[PDB]
Amino acid sequence: QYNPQPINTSSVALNNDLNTIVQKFSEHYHDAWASRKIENSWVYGENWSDSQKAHPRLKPYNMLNDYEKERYKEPVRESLKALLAIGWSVEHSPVDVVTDSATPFNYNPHPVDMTNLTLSREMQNMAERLAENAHDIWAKKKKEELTVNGGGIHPQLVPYDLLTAAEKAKDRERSQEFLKYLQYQGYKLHRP
Ligand SMILES: [Cl-]
Ligand SMILES: [Cl-]
Numbered sequence: 390q391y392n393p394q395p396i397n398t399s400s401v402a403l404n405n406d407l408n409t410i411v412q413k414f415s416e417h418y419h420d421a422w423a424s425r426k427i428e429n430s431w432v433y434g435e436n437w438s439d440s441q442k443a444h445p446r447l448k449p450y451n452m453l454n455d456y457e458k459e460r461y462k463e464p465v466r467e468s469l470k471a472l473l474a475i476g477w478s479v480e481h482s483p484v485d486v487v488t489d490s491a492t493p494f495n496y497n498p499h500p501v502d503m504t505n506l507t508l509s510r511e512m513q514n515m516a517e518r519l520a521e522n523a524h525d526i527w528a529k530k531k532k533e534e535l536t537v538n539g540g541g542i543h544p545q546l547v548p549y550d551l552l553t554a555a556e557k558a559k560d561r562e563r564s565q566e567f568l569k570y571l572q573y574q575g576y577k578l579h580r581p
Pocket of ligand 1 (some may be wrong): 404406
């Protein structure tokens with residue numbers, strides 16, 4: 390069938406340096422996410438609405454609650470722990486009016502643009518492994534949720550390789566951008 394089994398991260402604990410890079414990427418990625426949502430005509434609203442394209446997380450990072458910040462930090466932290474777990478080493482060595490009208494918070498996100506940075510084929514492969522792991526983490530949690538509530542189904546409870554590209558996009562994009570951001574910030578990833 391499908392038995393999601395995330396990477397075993399036993400013993401792996403992030404030190405202050407790697408917690409800091411998780412924090413800095415999370416803030417960067419929030420601004421990249423907000424920039425994309427605003428480009429796609431989303432606006433801030435107190436309650437999330439898919440139909441009305443209103444999103445409560447469309448605020449400056451420092452106005453987010455801890456739940457909101459963890460939407461970024463949790464999967465990023467887990468992807469970094471998974472990389473370490475499988476033996477990789479991590480060496481730290483004008484304002485447009487319609488853009489501004491998307492929120493009442495004078496928020497014009499301008500994250501660093503890493504579209505001109507490239508990833509080796511090896512790092513592209515690693516981003517796919519980390520995205521698959523994010524999917525397995527989600528799937529294991531979802532199966533637990535369904536089972537304790539007496540059963541049920543979910544259309545994305547299939548192996549990562551059976552998801553469509555569109556289904557894979559959120560996790561793939563996060564890991565690709567994280568690996569670019571590590572590169573940008575002067576980290577070197579070394580294979581086992
Ligand atoms: Cl430390
Ligand atoms: Cl923070």
